[PDB]
Coordinates of C-alpha atoms in Angstrom, one line a residue:
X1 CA 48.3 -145.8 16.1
X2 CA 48.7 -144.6 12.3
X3 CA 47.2 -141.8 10.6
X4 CA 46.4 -138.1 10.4
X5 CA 48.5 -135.5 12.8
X6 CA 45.6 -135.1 14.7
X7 CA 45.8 -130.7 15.9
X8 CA 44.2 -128.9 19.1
X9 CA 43.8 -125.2 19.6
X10 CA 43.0 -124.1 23.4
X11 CA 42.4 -120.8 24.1
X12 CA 44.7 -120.4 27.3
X13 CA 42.0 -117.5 28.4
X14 CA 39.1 -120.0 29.2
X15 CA 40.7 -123.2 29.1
X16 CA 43.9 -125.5 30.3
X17 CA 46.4 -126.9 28.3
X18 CA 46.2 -130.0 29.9
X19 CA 42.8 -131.0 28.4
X20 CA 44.8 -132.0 25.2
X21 CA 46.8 -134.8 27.2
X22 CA 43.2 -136.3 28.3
X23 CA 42.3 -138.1 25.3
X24 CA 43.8 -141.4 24.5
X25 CA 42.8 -144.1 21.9
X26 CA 40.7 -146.6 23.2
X27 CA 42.1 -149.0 21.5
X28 CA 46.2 -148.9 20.6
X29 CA 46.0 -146.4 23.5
X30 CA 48.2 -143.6 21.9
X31 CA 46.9 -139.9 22.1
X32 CA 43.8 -138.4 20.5
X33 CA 46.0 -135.4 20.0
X34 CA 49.8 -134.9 18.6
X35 CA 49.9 -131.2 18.7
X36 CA 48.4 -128.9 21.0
X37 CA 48.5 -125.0 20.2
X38 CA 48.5 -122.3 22.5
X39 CA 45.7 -119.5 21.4
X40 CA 47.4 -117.0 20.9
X41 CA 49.9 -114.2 21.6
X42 CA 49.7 -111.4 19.9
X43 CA 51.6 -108.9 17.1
X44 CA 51.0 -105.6 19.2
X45 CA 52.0 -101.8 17.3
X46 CA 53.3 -99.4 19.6
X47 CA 52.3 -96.1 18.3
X48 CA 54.9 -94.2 19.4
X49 CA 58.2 -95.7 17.9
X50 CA 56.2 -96.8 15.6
X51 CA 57.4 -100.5 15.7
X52 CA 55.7 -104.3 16.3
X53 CA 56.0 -105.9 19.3
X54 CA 55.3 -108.9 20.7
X55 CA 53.0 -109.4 23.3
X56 CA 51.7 -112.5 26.0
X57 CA 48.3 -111.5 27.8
X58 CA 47.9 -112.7 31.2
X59 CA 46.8 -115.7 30.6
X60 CA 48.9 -116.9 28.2
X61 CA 51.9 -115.4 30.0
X62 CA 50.6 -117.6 33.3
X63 CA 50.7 -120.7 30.7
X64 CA 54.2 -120.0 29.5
X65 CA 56.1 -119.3 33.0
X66 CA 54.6 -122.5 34.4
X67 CA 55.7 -124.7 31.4
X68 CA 56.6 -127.1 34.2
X69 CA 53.2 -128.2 34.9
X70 CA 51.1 -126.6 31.1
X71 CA 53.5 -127.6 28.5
X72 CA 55.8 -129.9 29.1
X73 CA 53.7 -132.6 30.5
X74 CA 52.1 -132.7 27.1
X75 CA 55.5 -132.9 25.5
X76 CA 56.5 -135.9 27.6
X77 CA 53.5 -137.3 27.0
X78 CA 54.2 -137.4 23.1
X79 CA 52.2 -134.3 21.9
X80 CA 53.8 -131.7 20.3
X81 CA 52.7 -127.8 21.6
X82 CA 52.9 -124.5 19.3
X83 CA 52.3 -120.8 20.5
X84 CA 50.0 -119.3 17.6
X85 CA 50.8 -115.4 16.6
X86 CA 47.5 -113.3 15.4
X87 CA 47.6 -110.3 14.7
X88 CA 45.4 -107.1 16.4
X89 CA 43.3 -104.5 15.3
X90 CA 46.3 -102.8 16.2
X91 CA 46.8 -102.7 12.9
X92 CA 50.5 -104.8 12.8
X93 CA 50.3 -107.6 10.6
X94 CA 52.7 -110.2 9.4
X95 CA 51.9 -108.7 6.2
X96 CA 53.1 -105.0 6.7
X97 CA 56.7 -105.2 7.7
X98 CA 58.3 -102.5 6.2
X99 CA 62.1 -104.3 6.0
X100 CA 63.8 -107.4 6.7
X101 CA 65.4 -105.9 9.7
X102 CA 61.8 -105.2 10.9
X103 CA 60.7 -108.6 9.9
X104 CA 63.8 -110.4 11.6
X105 CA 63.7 -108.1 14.8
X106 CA 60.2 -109.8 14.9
X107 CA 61.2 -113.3 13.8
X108 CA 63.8 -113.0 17.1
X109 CA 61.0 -111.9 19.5
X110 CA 59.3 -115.5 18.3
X111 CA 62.6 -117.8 18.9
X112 CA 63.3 -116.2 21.6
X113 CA 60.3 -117.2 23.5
X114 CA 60.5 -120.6 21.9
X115 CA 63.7 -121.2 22.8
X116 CA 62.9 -119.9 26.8
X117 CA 60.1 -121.8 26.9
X118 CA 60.8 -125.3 25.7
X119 CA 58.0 -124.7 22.9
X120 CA 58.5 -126.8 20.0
X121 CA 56.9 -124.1 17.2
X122 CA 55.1 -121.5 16.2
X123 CA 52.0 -120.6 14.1
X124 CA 50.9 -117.6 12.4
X125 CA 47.3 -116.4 12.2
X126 CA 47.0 -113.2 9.8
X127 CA 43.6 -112.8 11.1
X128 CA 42.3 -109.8 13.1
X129 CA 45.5 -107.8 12.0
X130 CA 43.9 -104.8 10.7
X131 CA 46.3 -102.9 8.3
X132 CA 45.4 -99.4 8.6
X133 CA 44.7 -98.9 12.0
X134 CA 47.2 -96.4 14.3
X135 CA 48.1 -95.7 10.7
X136 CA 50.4 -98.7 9.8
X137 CA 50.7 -99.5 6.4
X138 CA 48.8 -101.8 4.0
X139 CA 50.5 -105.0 3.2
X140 CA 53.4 -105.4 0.4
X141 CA 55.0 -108.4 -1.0
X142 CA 57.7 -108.6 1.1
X143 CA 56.8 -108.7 4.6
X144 CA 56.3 -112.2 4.8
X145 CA 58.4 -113.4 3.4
X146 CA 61.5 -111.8 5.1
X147 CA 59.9 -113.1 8.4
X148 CA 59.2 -116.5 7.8
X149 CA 63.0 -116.7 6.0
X150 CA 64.3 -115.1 9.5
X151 CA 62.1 -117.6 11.8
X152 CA 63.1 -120.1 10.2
X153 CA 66.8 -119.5 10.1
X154 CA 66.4 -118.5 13.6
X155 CA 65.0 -122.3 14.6
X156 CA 65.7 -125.0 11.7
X157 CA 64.4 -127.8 14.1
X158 CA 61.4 -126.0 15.2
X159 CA 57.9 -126.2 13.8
X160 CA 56.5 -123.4 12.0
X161 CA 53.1 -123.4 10.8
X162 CA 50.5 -121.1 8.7
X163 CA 46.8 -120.8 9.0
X164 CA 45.6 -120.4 5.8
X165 CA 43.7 -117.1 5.7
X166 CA 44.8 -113.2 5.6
X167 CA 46.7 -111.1 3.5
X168 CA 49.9 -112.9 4.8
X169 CA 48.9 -116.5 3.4
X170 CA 48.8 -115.5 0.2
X171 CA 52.1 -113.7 -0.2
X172 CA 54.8 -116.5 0.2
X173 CA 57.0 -115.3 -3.1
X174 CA 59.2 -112.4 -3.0
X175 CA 62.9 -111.2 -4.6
X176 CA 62.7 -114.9 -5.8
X177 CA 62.2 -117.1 -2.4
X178 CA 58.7 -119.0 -2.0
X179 CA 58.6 -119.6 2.0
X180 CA 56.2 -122.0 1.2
X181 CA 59.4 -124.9 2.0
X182 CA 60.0 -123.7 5.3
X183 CA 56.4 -124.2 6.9
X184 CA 56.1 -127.8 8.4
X185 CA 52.4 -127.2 8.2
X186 CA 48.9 -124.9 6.7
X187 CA 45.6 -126.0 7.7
X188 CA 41.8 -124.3 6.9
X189 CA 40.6 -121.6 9.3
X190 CA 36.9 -122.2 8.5
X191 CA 35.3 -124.5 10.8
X192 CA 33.3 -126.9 9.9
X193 CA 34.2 -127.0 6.2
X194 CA 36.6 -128.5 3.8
X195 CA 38.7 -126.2 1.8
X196 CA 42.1 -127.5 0.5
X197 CA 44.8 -124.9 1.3
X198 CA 47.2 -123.4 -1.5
X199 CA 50.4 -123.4 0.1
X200 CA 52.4 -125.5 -1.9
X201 CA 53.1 -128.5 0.6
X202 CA 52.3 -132.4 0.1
X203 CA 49.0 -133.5 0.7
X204 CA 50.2 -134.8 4.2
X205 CA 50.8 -132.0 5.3
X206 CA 47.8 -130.1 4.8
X207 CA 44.8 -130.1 6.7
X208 CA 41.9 -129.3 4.5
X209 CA 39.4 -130.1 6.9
X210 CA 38.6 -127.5 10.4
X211 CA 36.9 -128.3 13.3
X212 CA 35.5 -126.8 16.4
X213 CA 35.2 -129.2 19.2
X214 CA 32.1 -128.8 20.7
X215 CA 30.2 -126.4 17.9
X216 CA 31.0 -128.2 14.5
X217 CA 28.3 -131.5 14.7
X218 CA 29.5 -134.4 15.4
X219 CA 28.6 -135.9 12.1
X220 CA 30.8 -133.0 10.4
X221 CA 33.8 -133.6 13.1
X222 CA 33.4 -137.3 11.3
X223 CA 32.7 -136.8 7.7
X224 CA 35.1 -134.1 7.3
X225 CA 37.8 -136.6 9.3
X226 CA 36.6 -139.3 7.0
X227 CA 38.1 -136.8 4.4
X228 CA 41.0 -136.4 5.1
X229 CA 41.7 -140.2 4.9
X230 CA 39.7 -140.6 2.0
X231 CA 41.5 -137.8 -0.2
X232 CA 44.9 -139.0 1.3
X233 CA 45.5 -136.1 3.5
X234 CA 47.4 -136.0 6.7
X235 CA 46.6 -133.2 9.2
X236 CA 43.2 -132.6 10.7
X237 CA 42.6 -129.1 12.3
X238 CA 40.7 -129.1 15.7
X239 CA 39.6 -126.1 17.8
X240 CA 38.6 -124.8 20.7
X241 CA 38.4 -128.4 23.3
X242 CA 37.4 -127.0 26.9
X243 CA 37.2 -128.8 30.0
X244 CA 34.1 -130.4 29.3
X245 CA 33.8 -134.4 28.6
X246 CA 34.5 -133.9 24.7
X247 CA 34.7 -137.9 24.7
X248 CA 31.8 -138.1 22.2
X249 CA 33.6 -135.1 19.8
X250 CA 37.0 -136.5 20.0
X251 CA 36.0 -140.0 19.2
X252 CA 33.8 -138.7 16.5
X253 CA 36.9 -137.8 14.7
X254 CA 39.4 -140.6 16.0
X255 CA 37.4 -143.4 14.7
X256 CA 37.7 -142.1 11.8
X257 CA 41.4 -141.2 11.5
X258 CA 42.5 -144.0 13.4
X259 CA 39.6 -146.3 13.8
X260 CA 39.5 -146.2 17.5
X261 CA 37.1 -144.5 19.7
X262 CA 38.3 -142.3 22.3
X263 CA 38.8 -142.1 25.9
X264 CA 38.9 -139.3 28.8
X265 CA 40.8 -140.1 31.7

């Protein structure tokens, strides 16, 4: 199969990982799916010292310590999985980091739990982070930027990617580095639209069009994935696939990416 990196996000609180594996072309027989994201772990504040922190809810800590049977069946399988980062109405943000130090103490927290759990990247999600609350601070110019420089020092082989939305997204520039270089991928938060993200990275690896499997129609999942091929584009955003036979929702989008309808197994 050729065309568009075709992206999953499951949210590890309703749904399995696995679901992501259970689409195959119909046709050349490769996946529906090359990356499949794990939604989402969280940027916690911790009143007290005053400090971020990461943080795994029960769910998505189950999904983690059994990587044996969640993750890396996907990843033998050919399909790539992230853990996405959101931020809390905690009021941490990936926008508020008040030093490098407290950007890289962060950035460490990430690799750390890529590198213990065999996950090939992360994703950030400056959503929901509500700068202000507990007190935290507003966001400033820097903050971003000293934490995606750290990630990705921290893991140069990893995959590191940005959903384009929040204060964080638009503050890639500071003490002369643009970040924008060191994400592998951005992609539109607003399902069921087409909006072309600003991150300066080629066409190909931007994903202008979002998608919710299961609630975006079927003829958006396929006009917005005839899109992407038809403006040259090379990542399609997909969110929230369940348990349930998507068949008809996946294919709706393969045919059009790859020209092959899709198949549960």
């Amino acid at each position: 199969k050729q065309g568009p990196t075709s992206v999953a996000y499951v949210e590890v609180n309703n749904n399995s990982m696995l679901n992501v594996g259970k689409y195959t072309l119909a046709d050349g027989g490769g996946n529906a799916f090359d990356v499949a994201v794990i939604f989402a772990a969280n940027i916690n504040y911790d009143t007290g010292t005053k400090t971020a922190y990461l943080h795994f809810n029960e769910n998505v800590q189950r999904v983690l310590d059994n990587a044996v049977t969640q993750i890396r069946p996907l990843q033998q399988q050919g399909i790539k999985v992230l853990l996405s980062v959101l931020g809390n109405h905690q009021g941490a943000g990936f926008a508020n980091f008040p030093s490098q130090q407290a950007a890289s103490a962060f950035a460490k927290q990430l690799s750390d739990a890529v590198a213990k759990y065999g996950l090939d990247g992360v994703d950030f999600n400056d959503e929901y982070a509500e700068y202000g609350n507990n007190g935290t601070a507003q966001p400033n110019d820097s903050s971003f930027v000293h934490l995606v420089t750290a990630l990705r020092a921290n893991m140069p082989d990893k995959i590191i990617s940005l959903y384009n939305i929040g204060p964080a997204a638009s503050r890639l520039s500071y003490g002369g580095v643009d970040v924008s270089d060191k994400f592998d991928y951005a992609w539109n938060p607003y399902y069921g639209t087409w909006q072309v993200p600003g991150i300066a990275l080629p066409k190909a690896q931007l994903s202008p069009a979002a998608v919710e499997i299961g609630r975006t129609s079927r003829s958006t999942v396929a006009d917005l994935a005839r899109r992407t091929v038809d403006e040259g584009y090379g990542v399609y955003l997909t969110y929230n696939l369940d348990g349930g036979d998507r068949t008809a929702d996946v294919s709706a989008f393969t045919r059009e990416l790859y020209g092959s309808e899709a198949v549960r197994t």
